[PDB]
Design a protein around this ligand. Structure first.
Ligand SMILES: CNC(=O)c1ccccc1Sc1ccc2c(/C=C/c3ccccn3)n[nH]c2c1
Length: 304
């Protein structure tokens, strides 16, 4: 289960072990940060992984009991696409991997100390003011929004899409930097109500563009729709989308016909209009991530 993938619309991966391979004995595994059926992300201390002679807290994805060879192959392709994507401030950064025989495949990325953005924002409801040290403000929210737009613009430039863009897949680290990730195998989607059963699949319906729901099309522009939902999540401080609405056939029907969420509690007028732009019924009429980067950039400096 991987949602970050090469864009099929853009098609038509080696492994440089001398670069990426990290000795398992320089890694000390710690507590779980997330668990799915067949995979998990665990906190760990990596000695010298990115700076000579320095201990570094990292996150490591690996398989668990119940996984089979096909999950193993899938994790390997996750490693390979992370290598292809390369470095950007706003995408969780690959630091190394353990791929030698005799032990588990392990994919090592930077640790983001505040966890996923949805949970985090939902914990700051009592510590927010629009304009008190450690209180969140409108500036933070706009800034997080701007950052994710940049990461997504970057992913687009690497010819990838994110099939599961949502606040639960945004991480907050120090210095108010947010990073796009995908828990993937390390999330239990059969147990997480954000994923709704449909066919043999469990899908993030509330984040999905109508053409994705009805036609099963995944494009970068369907990602823009999800980004609109993510914006709504940010400016609701971590609320669940479409509050108190049964996600069924009629939901999808009303969505295709043009029903949208009302403005969240902490939004500005400009931001809500931006959400609405992202939720344009016509994919080609939605803004691009580049246009969003520019626009959120202006909203940011305008705000301060
Ligand atoms: C596309 N692949 C990945 O995103 C990925 C690859 C390897 C390992 C993990 C991930 S996803 C991920 C999930 C959680 C994390 C964290 C920390 C989360 C946290 C922090 C505090 C409390 C609870 N959870 N840091 N970095 C992470 C990366």
């Amino acid at each position: 289960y991987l949602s970050i993938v090469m864009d099929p619309d853009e098609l038509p991966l080696p492994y440089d072990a001398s670069k990426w391979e990290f000795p398992r004995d320089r890694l000390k595994l710690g507590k779980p940060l997330g668990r799915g059926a067949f995979g998990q992300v665990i906190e760990a201390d990596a000695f010298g992984i990115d700076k000579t002679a320095t201990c570094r807290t990292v996150a490591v994805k690996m398989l668990k009991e119940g996984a089979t060879h096909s999950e193993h192959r899938a994790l390997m392709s996750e490693l390979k696409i992370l290598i292809h994507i390369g470095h950007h401030l706003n995408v969780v950064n690959l630091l190394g991997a353990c791929t030698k025989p005799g032990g588990p495949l392990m994919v090592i990325v930077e640790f983001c100390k505040f966890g996923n953005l949805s949970t985090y924002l939902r914990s700051k409801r009592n510590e927010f003011v629009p304009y008190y040290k450690d209180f969140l403000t409108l500036e933070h929210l706009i800034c997080y929004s701007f950052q994710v737009a940049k990461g997504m613009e970057f992913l687009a430039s690497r010819k990838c899409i994110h099939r599961d863009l949502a606040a639960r897949n945004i991480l907050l680290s120090e210095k108010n930097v947010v990073k796009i990730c995908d828990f993937g195998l390390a999330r239990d989607i059969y147990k997480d109500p954000d994923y709704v059963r449909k066919g043999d699949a469990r899908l993030p319906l509330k984040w999905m563009a109508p053409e994705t729901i009805f036609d099963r099309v995944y494009t970068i522009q369907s990602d823009v729709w999800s980004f609109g939902v993510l914006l709504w999540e940010i400016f609701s401080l971590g609320a669940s989308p479409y509050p108190g609405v049964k996600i069924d056939e009629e939901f999808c029907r009303r969505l295709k016909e043009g029903t949208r969420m009302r403005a969240p509690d902490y939004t500005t007028p400009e931001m809500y209009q931006t959400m609405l732009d992202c939720w344009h019924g016509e994919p080609s009429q939605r803004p691009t991530f580049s246009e969003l980067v520019e626009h959120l950039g202006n909203l940011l400096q305008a705000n301060a």
